[PDB]
Design a binder for this molecule. Structure first.
Ligand SMILES: NC(=O)c1ccc[n+]([C@@H]2O[C@H](COP(=O)([O-])OP(=O)(O)OC[C@H]3O[C@@H](n4cnc5c(N)ncnc54)[C@H](OP(=O)(O)O)[C@@H]3O)[C@@H](O)[C@H]2O)c1
Ligand SMILES: NC(=O)c1ccc[n+]([C@@H]2O[C@H](COP(=O)([O-])OP(=O)(O)OC[C@H]3O[C@@H](n4cnc5c(N)ncnc54)[C@H](OP(=O)(O)O)[C@@H]3O)[C@@H](O)[C@H]2O)c1
Ligand SMILES: CC(=O)CCc1ccc(O)cc1
Lengths: 331, 341
């Protein structure tokens, strides 16, 4: 059968563009070995993928070969005993209709949620929100929480977890549509459009007159400098991402780190890879909340591999509204 | 009546401080408290020069943590003094104390709860401005409460020959860590290797590429950075941290005299290396003071911990000694002796 693929053309400098990926089709036979033959259903667009386009923490993409990243797929055939034909899995797969995988995947049991959730809410981004918030921030009822990129895959979940814990939660996002989602769907206490704030420090002083106990950091740069002098004593910054920096040849300087001393702040980075032993517990905690409607999720869903390059590039302009999903083929 | 020489704060400072930002005057005073006073009459013996005092020479700051100095009034800071007279039953004449006092020969103290009563005089009294006072406590709290050090881990100490750093490094050695310090002269580097027992040490002024220098001294990276300096030094450390590394943010003295702090560019290293970078203030740790003293005094007695002070004689020399911190003039902990006892 035919197998369209999104190919990585060549290593990227600065921002990515659609020409850095190329669409192609190849002829393949659907059989097989100890590996796995997958029909790819959904693909995630995740900000970290930009780092794999550079010639730090995982191998770079290989020019001429398909983009790889997190997806949800159906097992067509297996030469490994732990997976059988018909299994649904999430994990790393290729940007293509069908992939042969030499491997680590999670077998999906609960199918009474939209399968696309295993690219986001129930996949790596949701695990990231859970680990960063519950394992790094030591949150307590009554504490104030600021979430940057608050309407995104990770942010929208951090904010809801913080509300469930009894925190006072403010988010920022880059459009009126996203700010409305934060206040009207996700139940943030307050939210603002950071692109329309002339002075970020002023906005944070208004929304946190007594300071910020917890900053869930997704953005870096200027936003982090605005946060630092607004932290409360013994405040915490969970350093999750710094997406404002990912396309710079030279990262921007952050000037306000003396605030860490005078406010005795713990600023700690983490990688979700180190928390996957908690994935079972994460499911135990979140799947009931989804059931009882305490946790909701917004996805941005585009159809077809042909649209995956623009969906990935759109992350760095804020084009996605919520978690960016690419539908290769519905279940 | 006796004379009371004083160091007066002349006016608020912009940029680096200079001698002329302070004034020396002599006043007449009577060694007697007012009737009904509940305060202390102190004779000041030793004064500390400490880097944080620069912040008090500016009128106001977003990140202020204490009131600034008042122009026309004496400099205030940590010192060691003897009680001459007391309106507070907790102190009797002849008691020796350490805590905040005036840059003068005699002070009257109203707020007496910052004062620690010295019990052990088995040691030079000057120790209570440094090793056994606030800088020593800082090193103890920052290293043992913030850094979670373990045997075999690698430790980098900036301003390592200073009041805080020289103790951090020795604590690290005693814990079984591998310790490298940097300082800004050959004299200081020699102390690090030959008196304090650091595994290695370098003069950071001799290294045009600090990141490369740290790669040479830490071939497998840094578990713990005891941060005293900030700026380019911090940026050189960040890519050299190990996974689950820790930075104890104690001070950033390279920033204290700038109108705009320098930008630190390598913070994404915190993510990929899962580093905890945590600031702290020693004032939050004085509940551990008794335990600190129980720990360090036997080490001092057994010669297992040593200390280097920079000692200048006389209040006339105090302004130069404070200014000198910011160009590295002090060799070890900067002390001013007001009256040698
Ligand atoms: N440490 C880990 O293990 C880990 C794991 C996953 C993700 N992360 C990080 O978590 C963060 C969010 O990931 P996500 O999946 O949830 O992405 P996302 O929020 O769904 O999408 C990215 C968003 O970033 C915002 N953005 C882009 N450029 C920006 C800029 N220059 N300044 C400010 N905001 C900008 C946009 O939202 P606006 O419209 O609001 O601008 C955009 O929608 C990223 O930094 C990611 O790298 C970390
Ligand atoms: N609670 C707290 O958080 C707390 C408490 C006390 C102190 N501190 C901080 O800890 C640090 C050390 O204090 P300390 O009492 O021990 O002082 P110190 O080291 O005894 O004296 C200051 C030293 O700073 C170094 N220095 C000056 N300018 C520098 C620059 N631009 N770059 C690099 N090094 C520079 C000099 O040493 P070189 O010759 O090596 O340059 C100088 O001797 C300070 O930043 C201080 O504010 C924090
Ligand atoms: C789930 C992952 O594998 C990566 C998460 C991520 C990590 C670092 C970063 O800078 C952005 C996203």
């Amino acid at each position: 059968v035919s197998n369209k693929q999104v190919i990585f053309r060549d290593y990227v400098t600065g921002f990515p563009k659609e020409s850095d990926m190329e669409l192609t089709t190849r002829s393949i036979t659907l059989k097989l070995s100890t590996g796995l033959l997958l029909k790819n259903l959904y693909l995630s667009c995740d900000p970290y993928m930009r780092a794999r386009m550079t010639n730090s923490y995982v191998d770079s993409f290989k020019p001429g070969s398909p983009i790889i990243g997190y997806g949800v797929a159906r097992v067509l055939e297996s030469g490994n005993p732990k997976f059988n034909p018909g299994d649904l899995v999430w994990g790393f797969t290729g940007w293509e209709e069908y992939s042969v995988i030499t491997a680590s995947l999670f077998k999906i049991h609960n199918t009474d949620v939209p399968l696309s959730y295993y690219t986001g809410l129930l996949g790596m981004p949701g695990m990231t929100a859970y680990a960063g918030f519950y394992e790094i921030c030591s949150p307590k009822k009554g504490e104030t929480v600021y979430v940057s990129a608050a309407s995104g895959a990770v942010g929208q979940l951090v904010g809801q977890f913080a509300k469930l814990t009894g925190c006072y939660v403010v988010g920022s996002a880059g459009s009126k549509e996203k700010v409305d989602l934060l206040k009207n769907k996700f139940g943030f206490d307050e939210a603002f459009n950071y692109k329309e704030e002339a002075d970020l420090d002023a906005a944070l002083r208004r929304y946190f007159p007594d300071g910020i106990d917890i900053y869930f950091e997704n953005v870096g740069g200027k936003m982090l400098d605005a946060v630092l002098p607004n932290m409360r004593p013994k405040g915490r910054i969970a350093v999750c991402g710094m997406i404002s920096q990912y396309n710079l040849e030279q990262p921007e300087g952050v000037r306000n780190l003396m605030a860490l001393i005078v406010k005795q702040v713990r600023m700690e980075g983490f990688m979700v890879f180190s928390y996957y032993h908690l994935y079972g517990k994460f499911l135990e905690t979140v799947l009931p909340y989804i059931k009882q409607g305490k946790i909701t999720y917004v996805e941005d869903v585009v159809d077809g591999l042909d649209n995956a390059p623009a969906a990935l590039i759109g992350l760095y302009s804020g084009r996605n509204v919520g978690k960016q999903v690419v539908v290769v083929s519905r279940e």
